[PDB]
Design a protein around this nucleic acid. Structure first.
Lengths: 89, 96, 334, 92, 76, 108, 105, 93, 99, 84
DNA sequence: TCGAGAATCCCGGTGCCGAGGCCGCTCAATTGGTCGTAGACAGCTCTAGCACCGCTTAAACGCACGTACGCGCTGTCCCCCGCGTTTTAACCGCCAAGGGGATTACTCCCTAGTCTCCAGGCACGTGTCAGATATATACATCCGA
DNA sequence: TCGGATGTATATATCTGACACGTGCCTGGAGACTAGGGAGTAATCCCCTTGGCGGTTAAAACGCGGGGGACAGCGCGTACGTGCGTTTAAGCGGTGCTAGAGCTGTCTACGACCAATTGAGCGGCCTCGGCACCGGGATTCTCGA
């Protein structure tokens, strides 16, 4: 038959990375002035980076036959892309 | 009545958010964004309390590392403000 | 209005727990029941799945779109049968609403019931108004700009996710990027006379008398009836180089149409192409184009008719055919 | 004696292209590609078998390794090819 | 409604299939094409094994779906 | 005392050597117990990648009115495909040159 | 007569644990006796350098407890450590305090 | 069951390089991941050096060469000196 | 009568003629001497395989071209057309070679 | 047996101009021919150090074509066509 | 809007060398048993992931305003490119010499494996003080005049 | 250069939760012995690298003229920083539910391992044609009016 269960999914949550958050990441980066058209670009780049990292974190979990993406297979997903993460291993 | 000239508070925030280590992105919106992105790759995936933290501790540290390079590009064009073309050039040079 | 993180509005959460007093409270205040959440489930879907009747009665009496498509194009009949509600499917068939419906997989609701009773009961014979000009003149664009700023609107960079109204200067729609994004999104296409009507009355007019009765109108009714987009479950691959319309422009067209750009030429004898198992909603009712929705697109310049348009589930269609599809808002046969 | 996938890359070419040759330098690159990709997937499955404290490189580990290394639809196609192949192998 | 049974040698064959039949009859039909014994045919599709007893519509085999056919190593 | 010696490569339908892949998976100390289906899967993946690269290289060579594939054709095939370029992004195909492309601002 | 190997060489890092990790990591069929005592000495030096720099940063920061911020400062302030640990992301590490000369008035 | 780390050894090194300075917990986990990462770099390069020469064992040379390859410049010049001193003090005693 | 091409059109036909070719753009003997003099402070009296200097050159030409393909985008970023010594440094600092 | 010096000038200005033309550069400044040589020397030193220490570990005195490919692989610049 | 000249491309004819093929040989893939154990599976336990609710509150947001500067336009100059002439060394051909890479044989010392014994570090508590948290004070910095 | 508001640095009370320290134990580390083979060492063959000499010409070097672009200066609008009022979810506590991570026990099918076999791949050689090269006639850029 079928899953007999509505799959409630989330959408357009990239807006959670608000304009002041991007400004503080920039200010930490060293940026003085910020154009208004770069917030959409920044959140798009962030979504792309997460899709590139989470996809590896999910297949590191699906291999272990688990269903909870742990913190050790996320640092493993970041080590593969060179973005090594110290502090969680 | 007394108004820091455009750029004074900007430098005052650059000197502030560089000496601190606290996460600059709100934790719950980033967790919701992660759950919204991971739902494309597997349904009903759960995330550890430390997974999202580790997935954001190196996510904003990549965005901060990108914005240093966006600055270095905006300065190359003899500018102060960073524009989408700056980030595009930084990503194209870095191989992304 | 107020929404949950999952897109569940007040009516959605009211119908999920099946709180009927809240349902009446939000239905007698004027809330639109024909709304889909982030998945695409309507209040009809939620109510049918959880097993509630009075909310379904009020929704059917409050002019709610019953022929709606849910997450995987699941009609309310699918969930009502998949969850074993016989009186619910009886009440649904009391209004009809395409008893022979179809999900993305192709499984008509009967293929869910796994029950004799249902198998015997089934088989019997707006928001902000964004006004931006598409290929208009200078003073025409200034006119639209002042009409937007007097009617509480904005001016975007030729497109965004909130565009609802576009205009054509001529009588027929062109084939540029903006009109395709307008037709595929289900916007209102006007013949530039609507602004002429508003500048004489300083108020909004009716878009029905100024809309062209062609493919774009079919797309408007498609968006209004909450049915899926044109190129749903259709996978498109761009072969070779393009000069008339950029490959990037076609990619954006396929993305706006809901279809997936295949990145790797679909081999007709491989296992990936034959394991697709998706159908296309706007394919002809009972033709040989539903079970085979995977197209290799190419500009009809040198490679002519290869004497074989369909090889299994992979179609070889020209870009002119892809444009005529948006012209007619259909999937023409080959 | 030195080993190379030249005999095989010619066989694969005669399948993808009936009338097409490969120069010595192209065979040297295609052999390096097959050795480099083999080493990538083998090292990934090695690091993938050590993460789960396993000691056996299974078809599942190679499938996950080619899902990790190969990007985009290339991985989805290679997984299907490997699946089709191992199914025809274990069914005989 | 016809399928493409690809043997390990690469030679494919076309044969009429009923959209609602099972695997037994279409497997016995191969004997009328190449003389392959039904007990040891082991057809494969989409990476699955497609064991007998279930209809072809269960595996969603539509028209012109290229299947495979590996024979057990005793007569290959 | 022994039946026919049908090699594992022909049993899986693929062209690459299942036996050589199995020998190299065992003799490279990637693990202790290399499975039986793992060499078949890896040989199939390698064969598919080689087939894709060769098909793209042949399509690039037919555009140059040449039949024999040269490193230039492999470079034109890998760098033109988005997925294959991501895979080989840090790879220099010797004698391959670069993609012919000039910036729209540089042209008059 | 239970003289551990870490005390013979005069190191502070475990020679036996490094040997066990070299044997279990499946790096080679055989492992020399001088490899763990050599690898445990390079790790003992790298640690004794990054911790020295972190302690210097903590002393210049008026603190007596090395935190991730001090480790980040120690890693990014040295030229050799910034090249070795160039791709790593120290959690809760922050960013080196620096501002471009063009932005300063 | 339980995890293993270089926490006590990092503490013993810190007690001799900075007798008055302590370490945190998050900074200790970072040092433990750093030691576990340089290990996988030098040992990961040792596997490669052994295979490139058809060797089956990892001697002191195949670890010195990996320190020289991975460690950058002066760090490598000092690290091989420390390793040679440790090997000399271990073989003689 | 003395046909002299405009400044900028010979460079375009030189780009079109060197982007479709695969030959090494640096002469073999000077690059070999450069490699041999660079490998003189590491280990004196060192021999080089005939295919080693070629591999070094085959990688070095690709590296300098990928650098010139990245430093040309910086020159266009500054609304210029020529590459300056200030944009190679930028392309190498963004790539992670001078940070 | 021979002592060599100042051979980076052997990378002539027209050679760098050809490399830039291949890279897509239309106009080159006069100071590029001195910074490109420095970048070239830096990269060649970075690769040749690894190749030479590979050779020294192999107890050889001839830098082969394989350890150079290995040195390029260590820096994420794997070179196809010289593996054999 | 036209006229002379350079570069690109296609067609046809020639010719050196490398790709495809064939043959002898050998060692690695295949098959057949045989035995040990890795992990698939069933089962039990516990914890952290998920969900919800209530309350506070600091950050996100919209709006008004000023001005910093991004960009466009103009002018200047300078330096890089295109070209002709001189130079010179890269390259090809040929020849010679020998240092070391590859191979093989011999041996022996180093390391895996096994049995036994023992104490070092981890889980579990448990006491304690250093950086945050608030409060008060002083110095240097930015903005206005 | 001087005056006022304010960010930033510094001294002090207390304070609490994470860090430093003590203890049981058990499992991993250390000793000792044995066996096997991986690698160190010596001898040998050749081959592949290095060095040198002679001639050629095509790339490199240099001088020169000019014009196109780099760069400085100035004006204008507009878009971004900044402040203020409002709001709106982030965040923290408190509780509850249970899905799944984690550990334990059985056993069985799968993979290591050894012996015999053979045929597919690998090295040596052998030939011919796709491709490099050159000449002629007919399409595209480019300079230059």
């Amino acid at each position: 038959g079928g899953a007999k269960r509505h799959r409630k999914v989330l959408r357009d949550n990239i807006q959670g990375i608000t304009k002041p958050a991007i400004r503080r990441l920039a200010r930490r980066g060293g940026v003085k002035r910020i154009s208004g058209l770069i917030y959409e670009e920044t959140r798009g780049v962030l979504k792309v980076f997460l899709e590139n990292v989470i996809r590896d974190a999910v297949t590191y979990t699906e291999h272990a036959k688990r269903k909870t993406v742990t913190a050790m297979d996320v640092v493993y997903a970041l080590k593969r892309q060179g973005r090594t993460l110290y502090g969680f291993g | 009545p007394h108004r820091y000239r455009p750029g004074t508070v900007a430098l005052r925030e650059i000197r502030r958010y560089q000496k601190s280590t606290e996460l600059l992105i709100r934790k719950l919106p980033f967790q919701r964004l992660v759950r919204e992105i991971a739902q494309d790759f597997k349904t009903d995936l759960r995330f550890q309390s430390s997974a999202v933290m580790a997935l954001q501790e190196a996510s904003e540290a990549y965005l901060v590392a990108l914005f240093e390079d966006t600055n270095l590009c905006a300065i190359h064009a003899k500018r102060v403000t960073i524009m989408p073309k700056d980030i595009q050039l930084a990503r194209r040079i870095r191989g992304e | 209005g107020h929404m949950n993180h999952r897109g569940e509005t007040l009516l959605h959460i009211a119908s999920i727990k099946g709180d009927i007093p809240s349902v009446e409270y939000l239905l007698q205040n004027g809330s639109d029941p024909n709304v889909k959440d982030h998945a695409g489930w309507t209040p009809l879907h939620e109510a049918c799945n959880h097993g509630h009747l009075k909310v379904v009665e009020l929704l059917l009496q409050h002019k709610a779109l019953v022929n709606t498509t849910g997450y995987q194009n699941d009609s309310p009949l699918h969930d009502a049968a998949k969850n074993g509600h016989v009186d619910i499917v009886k009440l649904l068939l009391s209004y009809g609403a395409s008893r022979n419906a179809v999900n993305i997989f192709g499984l008509r609701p009967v293929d869910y019931t796994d029950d004799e009773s249902m198998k015997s009961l089934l088989l019997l014979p707006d928001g902000p108004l964004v006004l931006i000009g598409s290929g208009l003149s200078s003073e025409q664009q200034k006119m639209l700009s002042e009409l937007a700023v007097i009617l509480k609107a904005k001016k975007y960079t030729e497109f965004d996710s909130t565009v609802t109204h576009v205009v054509v200067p001529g009588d027929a729609v062109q084939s540029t990027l903006k009109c395709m994004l307008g037709i595929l999104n289900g916007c209102w296409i006007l013949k530039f006379e609507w602004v002429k009507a508003c500048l004489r009355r300083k108020v909004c007019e009716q878009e029905e008398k100024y809309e062209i009765p062609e493919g774009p109108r079919r797309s408007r009714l498609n968006r209004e009836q909450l049915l899926p987009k044109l190129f749903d479950g259709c996978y498109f691959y761009l072969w070779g180089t393009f000069k008339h319309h950029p490959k990037d422009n076609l990619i954006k067209l396929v993305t706006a149409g809901g279809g997936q750009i295949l990145s790797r030429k679909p081999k007709p004898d491989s296992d990936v192409t034959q394991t697709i198992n998706t159908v296309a909603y706007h394919a002809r009712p009972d033709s040989d184009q539903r079970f085979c929705t995977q197209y290799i697109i190419y500009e009809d310049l040198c490679n002519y008719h290869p004497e074989r348009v369909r090889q299994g589930k992979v179609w070889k269609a020209p870009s002119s055919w892809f444009i005529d599809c948006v012209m007619s808002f259909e999937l023409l046969p080959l | 004696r030195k080993e190379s996938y030249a005999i095989y890359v010619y066989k694969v070419l005669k399948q993808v292209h009936p009338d097409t040759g490969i120069s010595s330098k192209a065979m040297s690159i295609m052999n390096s590609f097959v050795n480099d990709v083999f080493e990538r997937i083998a090292g990934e499955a090695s690091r993938l078998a050590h993460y789960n404290k396993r000691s056996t490189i299974t078809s599942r580990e190679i499938q996950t390794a080619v899902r990790l290394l190969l990007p985009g639809e290339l991985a989805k196609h290679a997984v299907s090819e490997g699946t089709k192949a191992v199914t025809k192998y274990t069914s005989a | 409604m016809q399928i493409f049974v690809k043997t390990l040698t690469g030679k494919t064959i076309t044969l009429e299939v009923e959209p609602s039949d099972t695997i037994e009859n279409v497997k016995a039909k191969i004997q009328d094409k190449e003389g392959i014994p039904p007990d040891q045919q082991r057809l494969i599709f989409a990476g699955k094994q497609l064991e007998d007893g279930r209809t072809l519509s269960d595996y969603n085999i539509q028209k012109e779906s290229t299947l495979h056919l590996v024979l057990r190593l005793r007569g290959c | 005392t022994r039946a026919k010696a049908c090699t594992r490569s022909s049993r899986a339908g693929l062209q690459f050597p299942v036996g050589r892949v199995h020998r190299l998976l065992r003799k490279g100390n990637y693990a202790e117990r290399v499975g039986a289906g793992a060499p078949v899967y890896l040989a199939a993946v390698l064969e598919y990648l080689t087939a894709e690269i060769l098909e793209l290289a042949g399509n690039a060579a037919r555009d140059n009115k040449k039949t024999r594939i040269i490193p230039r054709h492999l470079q034109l095939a890998v760098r033109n495909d988005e997925e294959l370029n991501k895979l080989l992004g840090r790879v220099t195909i010797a004698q391959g040159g670069v993609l012919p492309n000039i910036q729209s601002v540089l042209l008059p």
